[PDB]
Amino acid sequence: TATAILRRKKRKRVVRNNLRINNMNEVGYDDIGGCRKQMAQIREMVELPLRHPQLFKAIGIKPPRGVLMYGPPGTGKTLMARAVANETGAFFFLINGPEVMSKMAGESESNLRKAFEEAEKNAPAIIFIDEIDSIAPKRDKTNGEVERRVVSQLLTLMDGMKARSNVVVIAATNRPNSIDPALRRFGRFDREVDIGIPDATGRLEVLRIHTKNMKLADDVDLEALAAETHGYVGADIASLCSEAAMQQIREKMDLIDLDEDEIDAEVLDSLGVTMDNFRFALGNSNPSALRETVVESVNVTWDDVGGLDEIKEELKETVEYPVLHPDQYTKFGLSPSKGVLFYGPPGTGKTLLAKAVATEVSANFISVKGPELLSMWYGESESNIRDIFDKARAAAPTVVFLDELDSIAKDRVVNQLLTEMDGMNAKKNVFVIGATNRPDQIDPAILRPGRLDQLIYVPLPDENARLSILNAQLRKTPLEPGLELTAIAKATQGFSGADLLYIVQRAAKYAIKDSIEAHRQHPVPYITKEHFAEAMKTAKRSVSDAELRRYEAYSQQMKAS
Amino acid sequence: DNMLLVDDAINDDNSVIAINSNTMDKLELFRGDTVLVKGKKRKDTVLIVLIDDELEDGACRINRVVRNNLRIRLGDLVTIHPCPDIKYATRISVLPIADTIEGITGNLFDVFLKPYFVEAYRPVRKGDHFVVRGGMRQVEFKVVDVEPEEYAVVAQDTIIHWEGEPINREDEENNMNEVGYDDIGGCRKQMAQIREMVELPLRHPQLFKAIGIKPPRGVLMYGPPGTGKTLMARAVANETGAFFFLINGPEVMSKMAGESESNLRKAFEEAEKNAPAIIFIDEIDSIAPKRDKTNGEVERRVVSQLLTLMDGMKARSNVVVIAATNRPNSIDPALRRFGRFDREVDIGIPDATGRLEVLRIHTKNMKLADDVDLEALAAETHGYVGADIASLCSEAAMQQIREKMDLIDLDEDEIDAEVLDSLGVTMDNFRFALGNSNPSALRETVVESVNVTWDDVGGLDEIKEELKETVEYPVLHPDQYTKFGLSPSKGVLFYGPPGTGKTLLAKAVATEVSANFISVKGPELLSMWYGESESNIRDIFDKARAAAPTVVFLDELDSIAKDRVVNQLLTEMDGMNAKKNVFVIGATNRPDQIDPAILRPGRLDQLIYVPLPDENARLSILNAQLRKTPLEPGLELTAIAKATQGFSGADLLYIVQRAAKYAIKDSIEAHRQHPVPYITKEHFAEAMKTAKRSVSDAELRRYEAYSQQMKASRGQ
Amino acid sequence: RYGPLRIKELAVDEELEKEDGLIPRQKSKLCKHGDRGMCEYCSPLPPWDKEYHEKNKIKHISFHSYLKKLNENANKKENGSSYISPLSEPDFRINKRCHNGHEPWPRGICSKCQPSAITLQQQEFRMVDHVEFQKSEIINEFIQAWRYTGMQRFGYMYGSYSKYDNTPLGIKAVVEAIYEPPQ
Ligand SMILES: Nc1ncnc2c1ncn2[C@@H]1O[C@H](COP(=O)(O)OP(=O)(O)OP(=O)(O)O)[C@@H](O)[C@H]1O
Ligand SMILES: Nc1ncnc2c1ncn2[C@@H]1O[C@H](COP(=O)(O)OP(=O)(O)O)[C@@H](O)[C@H]1O
Ligand SMILES: Nc1ncnc2c1ncn2[C@@H]1O[C@H](COP(=O)(O)OP(=O)(O)O)[C@@H](O)[C@H]1O
Ligand SMILES: Nc1ncnc2c1ncn2[C@@H]1O[C@H](COP(=O)(O)OP(=O)(O)O)[C@@H](O)[C@H]1O
Ligand SMILES: [Zn+2]
Ligand SMILES: [Zn+2]
């Protein structure tokens, strides 16, 4: 069950080199890391149909064929496909999207015909239709005759392929909805796999895989780099390493005479990548995966947040029990609730609560910020709500955090969201968590049963919660020995978490200012109480009293009702 | 050692070099030795070594022709190496220069070359020049072809083929390729970037093998049209010595259907087959425009073929692809990911020094008159790209020709050489050309550099220190921020009455950290809102990233911040990496009208008030605006500054401008009547008589009330 | 090689290459311009003009003229490229070694080394234009062979090539003798 196929080179000093223990293909499972679940799914759906076809005969079923991988560009879909194909060691026919699309008119279809015919002839075969979108975009995108001839030919070949032949088709596309919808029916690319950005452990694995040949200096802390790099896809990490090496060589260029074709061997052998080079590369790099909705994991437990004990218990009862113990729910025959809606003053930490809920069920987390909602409302966002929920289904269990519903729920977008939520499978674990500061403005239609009906109030932090938050925010900062914070926490009655963050940030700013002054004068390794007092002299609440009274009145109305 | 000094040789032989005895001993050379000499631009030649003690130790003498061939000037350094493996030229094909051979009758070969090569054994290499002085004539030639290649010794038995059509001289000059770095000025930063990104992968590939990394391949340059992108690419290619394979966009897109793909495939195949190579895809936007543009199949097949070729070259081949586009968003987005044009370079309008360098580069063949003040022209030319400066020089020359046209007979087709000598451009001609100039770079947002210090902004010391601690410290001491684990602040929002000089503060902040400055005025934002502009916010921030450390400036943001545009701006601000040294500075007069979303933390949160100038500040502003004006000796502006309480900087500028207008009026009237080199205090009094405040009391009170509210909001 | 290839070929090719073959045309009655200055109908006719060939009952275009057409179609001077060979003999055999990650054809193939569909089409340029028999005896004896024996024959025909004025940049193969192999 689960990742059961992963447990236990490339079918292959001189002996070690021969046994593999510019064109160095045949990258095995070793050359991939941080995507264990998806790799396990692909292996399970590819190997067994080909390596061991007699099991299906013994049990008497027709194995699924179409496999559709999709995820943000650069996550390594092509790498995974090539690795699986080489590991299986079967006739591997490779077809690219643009490569076929670049042919003359009338020749981009005969190539597909011959490809499928040859794959059938030499079974078992694996066909990797890379960038399938280019040859089968959305129906409205292309109206030309050729752009429909190609799609029709692809569909006919796919339908004709479904037979005893041990041939499996794999396709890759960044946008799940970009593919022609007709390609996602039974007997076609039905099984779908979602690739999400890696987590800290995945980033560490990727960095180790790429950083095995570079002449790394001893003062390298790859763990720190993995911790700092957030939202970096594998391609971004490779670019980071390349940029760091480029920076190292640039720094060493002083002793390098460019005029001479050759260089002194000692200088060439003295190259060494330092941590500062990696930091500079991080400064230069610029990830772009987060620009669009992606699937990622979170590791927030019930300790980075303060208070809200009743809220924590309510969320546990709502989400954990259906996930951990569905058997008792079936015993009582009651289906679990679908969504939840957090409301309260801003800055109380609703995002952290959503992340903690996702972590407890060990479910992937998808987010939709306010600007994303506005972009979708204006109809200039590449993705779509249907796309979001399709990815959520493919990556179940999942938690979809819709932030700032008030912007759109002041509607086409609201109607689409309602339809998607209603159409959700009852037993499938697709939780929806909404965040809003103005519950009244929200369209009441969303609050009907079977929807975001479970409203939860998030109160402002209490003295204990304020102290806990302040301690958590200052944990990773050099503080003066015996530096108390209870007095500050008590003095910050009515302060939201953002206010405490602002206070600590200003204190650190004063500390760094003093340190810079001292260094220029020549000292300040800590953040002493004077900086905190100076910052506090200017800090103040960010929530007006009337807002708090309105929230309290709404909570009282809900309780009474 | 072998870095011999260049000097003019007494002899007129084209393959003889005289060297010092001491250097000859150092290099173990001897008389009559044929040696390979390398100068500049990778130029090489073969010279017969002759001992000569007259030269100082470490110096060599070569004649004019050899220096011209080597593209080097007297006083430079040349490297001389042994050439013992030079074979005799089996067959040399040589043709003359047409202009030189004009007026020659009979067989040129017997007249000039036959005595020149017999009993001479002159080494000859392709692309060299040799001049024969026969009788009363002197004729230059070219080493068109040599067998064996590429060079060999012309022996007595060597066969010489002089047959062939004359070679026009205009080709060598007017086709002046092989342009070195000395032909590019004002863009040293981008030139250095391209050099460090191209030369090292090609010139020293073993470096990356030693470090065991895959060097970046794609490169994408972009900037305003006419900024010398093609010139920079050509210069880099020529200096690197790689197999340059220039490809044009319009040229490829003008072929019949089914031919552009073949041309691209053939080009890439040839580039691969002759590694190392440098492919330059000019005007790539004309090959792969944005998706929303032409949807025709002929417009998609070319893009798909280009993508396939780009993806297919990942191998041990030394191929570098350079593309040029006017804007980054024109190219299809698919061409901006890993394994493709992932490295970007931005070209911006030059500063004063850049314009001076451009003028000197172009104004070296002009017969300029003595009264030339290139520095003055550079100061008075703002926003000119290189092409505009070249056009300015051409127009000035045309104006000079027009002025001298009086002494020319148009009907006669011959002009006296004396008149031609008198030709010379003058400063008035350049001023007229400027008057006829039509700059167009500024019509869109463009990266630029500013040079304002903490002296053009009077007073406001607390604001200056706040900006310093907000911006300068992160850039210069990021290690401290890392030590304390504090993320630097992104941007600030300046608010206050108009005319306080917010733009000056932004420029000063940009200058202090030595950061490029990008400006986005209100009309540009409105044009983006209506969608009739050539650029979008995403493009602006992409250019800001490319030209980091940059400072983006928005003016009168309240016009759009009263929304699709604001949503795009928020998305871009959230997207940018925090570590990137990009600061977004907004300026507005009605802060409360700004959308609250803009003021949230992680965005333009910091809010800074810009008060009106005070008495000392007003005096400093007046003095600064009058530094380059002739004033009345003994005149004091303290009284004027005192009397101008409550006036803005724009008001003081208006007062000074009116005073200057009155001064010029009086001077012109006096000259017509015919004195007043400066401005007397009476003019200043007259100008002040018309003074009018640009700020009403109610608005100032409202600004003060808002400031008090903000202070109370942070006072507990 | 930074330009056109360097090799020595038949003299006919050289002499033909030296010529340009332009067919001059005089002032058409439809022109609107002074004596000097040619607009669109008075311009010289390129040697590859298909209209002239099909108008004069010539079915093909004298290969050298086709080479001139190809050279004119591209390869701008002084810039725009570093020379691309305009003529390439098509090859259909599958590349035995492509290796984007796949193995040779016998047990693996990609879409980059797959022979694309072949579009057969009548060629438009004929290399050799006119085959010329020096004397009637040369072939009369050959046919006399069949007359006497009654069986078919087969023999190579040696000869040499030369210009052919009757066609734009045309070539003629003059056959001198016939040799009959043992068959
Ligand atoms: N485990 C990994 N996950 C992600 N990237 C990886 C991993 N290991 C290596 N990489 C690097 O990440 C990049 C992935 O390239 P790849 O071509 O597979 O990406 P892609 O976006 O899936 O491709 P495609 O163009 O086919 O859509 C390469 O640099 C590869 O070296
Ligand atoms: N228990 C808590 N209460 C309030 N704020 C917290 C708490 N824990 C962490 N935070 C801080 O709250 C910030 C995010 O607030 P959150 O409410 O999740 O988003 P928003 O402010 O948009 O509603 C983080 O920067 C975090 O440091
Ligand atoms: N240093 C320079 N920077 C910019 N332009 C320059 C410079 N030196 C010369 N120029 C002139 O500016 C023009 C640059 O043309 P360019 O913009 O590169 O052409 P393209 O439109 O192909 O990009 C040319 O006329 C060139 O002679
Ligand atoms: N220290 C200063 N304070 C205010 N204005 C100044 C100062 N120094 C110069 N100025 C003038 O103020 C003008 C500002 O113009 P403008 O941009 O329209 O207003 P603002 O800069 O306030 O937005 C400039 O033309 C400049 O000459
Ligand atoms: Zn005419
Ligand atoms: Zn192949």
Side-chain angles (χ1 to χ4, degrees), chain B residues 183-187 224-232 248 280 282-283 324 347 350 354 357-358 361-362 385-388 390:
Chain B
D183 292 356
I184 300 89
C187 296
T227 60
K229 305 187 295 301
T230 303
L231 209 176
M232 294 177 183
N248 260 18
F280 180 74
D282 175 69
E283 290 293 346
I347 304 287
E357 294 169 351
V358 171
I361 290 167
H362 283 90
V385 302
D388 286 329

Short mmCIF file of all heavy atoms in Angstrom, two decimals, chain B residues 183-187 224-232 248 280 282-283 324 347 350 354 357-358 361-362 385-388 390, ligand 3:
data_model
loop_
_atom_site.label_atom_id
_atom_site.label_comp_id
_atom_site.label_asym_id
_atom_site.label_seq_id
_atom_site.Cartn_x
_atom_site.Cartn_y
_atom_site.Cartn_z
N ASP B 183 35.57 51.23 -29.68
CA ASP B 183 34.51 51.87 -30.44
C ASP B 183 33.19 51.93 -29.69
O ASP B 183 32.18 52.35 -30.26
CB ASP B 183 34.31 51.14 -31.77
CG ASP B 183 35.48 51.30 -32.71
OD1 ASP B 183 36.42 52.04 -32.36
OD2 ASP B 183 35.47 50.68 -33.79
N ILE B 184 33.17 51.51 -28.42
CA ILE B 184 31.98 51.55 -27.59
C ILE B 184 32.32 52.29 -26.31
O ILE B 184 33.29 51.94 -25.62
CB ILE B 184 31.44 50.14 -27.27
CG1 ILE B 184 31.09 49.40 -28.57
CG2 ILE B 184 30.22 50.23 -26.37
CD1 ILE B 184 32.24 48.62 -29.15
N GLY B 185 31.53 53.31 -25.98
CA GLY B 185 31.75 54.08 -24.78
C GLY B 185 30.43 54.44 -24.12
O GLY B 185 29.37 54.46 -24.75
N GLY B 186 30.51 54.71 -22.82
CA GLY B 186 29.35 55.08 -22.04
C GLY B 186 28.52 53.91 -21.54
O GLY B 186 27.53 54.14 -20.84
N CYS B 187 28.89 52.68 -21.88
CA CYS B 187 28.18 51.48 -21.45
C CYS B 187 29.17 50.43 -20.97
O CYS B 187 29.11 49.26 -21.36
CB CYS B 187 27.31 50.94 -22.57
SG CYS B 187 25.98 52.06 -23.09
N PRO B 224 16.19 50.60 -25.28
CA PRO B 224 15.59 51.47 -26.29
C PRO B 224 16.28 51.29 -27.62
O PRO B 224 17.50 51.03 -27.68
CB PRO B 224 15.82 52.88 -25.72
CG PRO B 224 16.08 52.68 -24.28
CD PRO B 224 16.75 51.36 -24.16
N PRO B 225 15.55 51.42 -28.73
CA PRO B 225 16.19 51.29 -30.04
C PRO B 225 17.21 52.39 -30.26
O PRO B 225 17.02 53.54 -29.86
CB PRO B 225 15.01 51.41 -31.02
CG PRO B 225 14.01 52.22 -30.28
CD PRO B 225 14.14 51.82 -28.84
N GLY B 226 18.32 52.02 -30.91
CA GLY B 226 19.36 52.98 -31.20
C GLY B 226 20.41 53.14 -30.12
O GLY B 226 21.14 54.14 -30.14
N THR B 227 20.52 52.20 -29.19
CA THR B 227 21.49 52.28 -28.11
C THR B 227 22.72 51.42 -28.35
O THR B 227 23.51 51.22 -27.43
CB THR B 227 20.84 51.87 -26.78
OG1 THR B 227 20.35 50.53 -26.88
CG2 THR B 227 19.69 52.81 -26.45
N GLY B 228 22.91 50.92 -29.57
CA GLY B 228 24.13 50.22 -29.90
C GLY B 228 24.18 48.76 -29.51
O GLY B 228 25.27 48.21 -29.33
N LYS B 229 23.02 48.10 -29.38
CA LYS B 229 23.02 46.68 -29.04
C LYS B 229 23.78 45.87 -30.09
O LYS B 229 24.66 45.07 -29.76
CB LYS B 229 21.58 46.18 -28.91
CG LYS B 229 20.75 46.98 -27.92
CD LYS B 229 19.38 46.35 -27.69
CE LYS B 229 18.53 46.36 -28.95
NZ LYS B 229 18.30 47.73 -29.46
N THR B 230 23.45 46.09 -31.36
CA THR B 230 24.14 45.37 -32.43
C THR B 230 25.63 45.68 -32.42
O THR B 230 26.46 44.80 -32.66
CB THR B 230 23.53 45.72 -33.78
OG1 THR B 230 22.13 45.42 -33.78
CG2 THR B 230 24.21 44.95 -34.89
N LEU B 231 25.99 46.94 -32.16
CA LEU B 231 27.39 47.31 -32.12
C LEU B 231 28.12 46.57 -31.00
O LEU B 231 29.23 46.07 -31.20
CB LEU B 231 27.53 48.82 -31.93
CG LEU B 231 28.78 49.46 -32.53
CD1 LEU B 231 28.74 50.96 -32.36
CD2 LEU B 231 30.03 48.88 -31.91
N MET B 232 27.51 46.48 -29.82
CA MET B 232 28.13 45.75 -28.72
C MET B 232 28.29 44.28 -29.07
O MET B 232 29.34 43.68 -28.80
CB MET B 232 27.30 45.91 -27.45
CG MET B 232 27.26 47.32 -26.91
SD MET B 232 26.21 47.47 -25.46
CE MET B 232 26.30 49.24 -25.17
N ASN B 248 19.55 37.86 -38.93
CA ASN B 248 18.59 38.94 -38.80
C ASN B 248 17.18 38.38 -38.65
O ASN B 248 16.89 37.24 -39.02
CB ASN B 248 18.65 39.86 -40.02
CG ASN B 248 19.44 41.12 -39.75
OD1 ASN B 248 20.22 41.19 -38.79
ND2 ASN B 248 19.25 42.13 -40.59
N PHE B 280 24.09 35.34 -33.11
CA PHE B 280 23.44 36.58 -32.71
C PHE B 280 22.13 36.70 -33.48
O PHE B 280 22.13 36.91 -34.70
CB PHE B 280 24.34 37.79 -32.99
CG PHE B 280 23.72 39.10 -32.61
CD1 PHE B 280 23.61 39.47 -31.28
CD2 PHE B 280 23.27 39.97 -33.58
CE1 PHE B 280 23.04 40.68 -30.93
CE2 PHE B 280 22.71 41.18 -33.23
CZ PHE B 280 22.60 41.53 -31.91
N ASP B 282 19.42 38.86 -34.16
CA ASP B 282 18.97 40.25 -34.06
C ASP B 282 17.46 40.34 -34.19
O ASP B 282 16.84 39.58 -34.94
CB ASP B 282 19.64 41.09 -35.14
CG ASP B 282 19.13 42.51 -35.16
OD1 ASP B 282 19.42 43.26 -34.20
OD2 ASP B 282 18.42 42.88 -36.12
N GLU B 283 16.87 41.28 -33.45
CA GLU B 283 15.44 41.55 -33.53
C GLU B 283 14.62 40.27 -33.40
O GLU B 283 13.76 39.96 -34.22
CB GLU B 283 15.10 42.28 -34.83
CG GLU B 283 15.60 43.71 -34.89
CD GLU B 283 14.89 44.61 -33.90
OE1 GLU B 283 13.83 44.19 -33.37
OE2 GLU B 283 15.38 45.73 -33.65
N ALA B 324 18.43 40.30 -29.29
CA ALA B 324 18.18 41.71 -29.02
C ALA B 324 16.71 42.01 -29.27
O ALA B 324 16.19 41.68 -30.34
CB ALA B 324 19.06 42.60 -29.89
N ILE B 347 20.05 47.84 -21.47
CA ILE B 347 20.81 48.97 -21.97
C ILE B 347 20.00 50.23 -21.70
O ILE B 347 18.81 50.29 -22.02
CB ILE B 347 21.12 48.83 -23.47
CG1 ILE B 347 21.86 47.52 -23.75
CG2 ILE B 347 21.95 50.02 -23.95
CD1 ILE B 347 23.29 47.52 -23.28
N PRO B 350 22.85 56.91 -21.84
CA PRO B 350 24.09 57.21 -21.12
C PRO B 350 23.99 58.50 -20.32
O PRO B 350 23.04 59.28 -20.45
CB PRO B 350 25.12 57.35 -22.25
CG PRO B 350 24.33 57.81 -23.41
CD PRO B 350 22.98 57.18 -23.29
N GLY B 354 29.17 59.38 -20.78
CA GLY B 354 28.87 58.53 -21.92
C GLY B 354 28.65 59.32 -23.19
O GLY B 354 29.14 58.96 -24.26
N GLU B 357 31.95 60.55 -24.47
CA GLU B 357 32.68 59.48 -25.13
C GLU B 357 32.12 59.22 -26.52
O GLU B 357 32.87 59.04 -27.48
CB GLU B 357 32.64 58.21 -24.29
CG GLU B 357 33.37 58.32 -22.97
CD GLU B 357 33.09 57.16 -22.05
OE1 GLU B 357 32.19 56.35 -22.37
OE2 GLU B 357 33.76 57.05 -21.00
N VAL B 358 30.79 59.20 -26.65
CA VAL B 358 30.18 58.97 -27.95
C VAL B 358 30.56 60.08 -28.92
O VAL B 358 30.91 59.82 -30.08
CB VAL B 358 28.65 58.85 -27.81
CG1 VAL B 358 27.99 58.84 -29.17
CG2 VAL B 358 28.29 57.60 -27.03
N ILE B 361 34.11 59.64 -30.04
CA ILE B 361 34.24 58.51 -30.95
C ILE B 361 33.77 58.89 -32.34
O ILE B 361 34.44 58.61 -33.34
CB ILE B 361 33.46 57.30 -30.41
CG1 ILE B 361 34.15 56.74 -29.16
CG2 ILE B 361 33.34 56.23 -31.48
CD1 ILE B 361 33.31 55.75 -28.38
N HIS B 362 32.61 59.55 -32.44
CA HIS B 362 32.10 59.93 -33.75
C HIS B 362 32.86 61.12 -34.32
O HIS B 362 33.13 61.17 -35.53
CB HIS B 362 30.61 60.26 -33.66
CG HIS B 362 29.74 59.05 -33.59
ND1 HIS B 362 29.36 58.47 -32.40
CD2 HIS B 362 29.16 58.31 -34.57
CE1 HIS B 362 28.59 57.42 -32.65
NE2 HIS B 362 28.46 57.30 -33.95
N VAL B 385 20.44 59.03 -27.17
CA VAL B 385 21.13 57.76 -27.35
C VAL B 385 22.23 57.96 -28.39
O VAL B 385 22.34 59.03 -28.99
CB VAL B 385 20.15 56.64 -27.78
CG1 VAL B 385 19.06 56.48 -26.75
CG2 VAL B 385 19.56 56.95 -29.15
N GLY B 386 23.06 56.93 -28.60
CA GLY B 386 24.17 57.08 -29.52
C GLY B 386 23.73 57.45 -30.93
O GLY B 386 24.34 58.30 -31.58
N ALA B 387 22.66 56.82 -31.41
CA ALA B 387 22.18 57.11 -32.76
C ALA B 387 21.81 58.58 -32.90
O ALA B 387 22.09 59.21 -33.93
CB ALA B 387 21.00 56.22 -33.11
N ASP B 388 21.16 59.14 -31.88
CA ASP B 388 20.81 60.55 -31.93
C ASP B 388 22.05 61.43 -32.01
O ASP B 388 22.05 62.44 -32.72
CB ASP B 388 19.97 60.93 -30.71
CG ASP B 388 18.55 60.39 -30.79
OD1 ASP B 388 18.03 60.26 -31.92
OD2 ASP B 388 17.96 60.10 -29.73
N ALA B 390 24.95 60.56 -33.36
CA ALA B 390 25.46 60.44 -34.72
C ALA B 390 24.66 61.31 -35.69
O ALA B 390 25.23 62.00 -36.54
CB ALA B 390 25.44 58.98 -35.16
N1 LIG D 3 28.70 53.55 -27.77
C1 LIG D 3 27.61 53.64 -28.53
N2 LIG D 3 26.40 53.48 -27.95
C2 LIG D 3 25.31 53.58 -28.73
N3 LIG D 3 25.22 53.81 -30.03
C3 LIG D 3 26.43 53.96 -30.58
C4 LIG D 3 27.64 53.89 -29.91
N4 LIG D 3 28.69 54.09 -30.80
C5 LIG D 3 28.11 54.27 -31.95
N5 LIG D 3 26.74 54.21 -31.89
C6 LIG D 3 25.82 54.38 -33.01
O1 LIG D 3 24.50 54.20 -32.55
C7 LIG D 3 23.78 53.31 -33.44
C8 LIG D 3 23.54 52.00 -32.73
O2 LIG D 3 22.72 51.14 -33.57
P1 LIG D 3 21.93 49.94 -32.85
O3 LIG D 3 20.87 50.50 -31.96
O4 LIG D 3 22.91 48.97 -32.28
O5 LIG D 3 21.19 49.22 -34.07
P2 LIG D 3 19.99 48.17 -33.93
O6 LIG D 3 18.74 48.92 -34.30
O7 LIG D 3 20.29 47.03 -34.88
O8 LIG D 3 20.01 47.75 -32.48
C9 LIG D 3 24.64 53.23 -34.70
O9 LIG D 3 24.34 54.29 -35.60
C10 LIG D 3 26.05 53.37 -34.12
O10 LIG D 3 26.98 53.85 -35.07
#
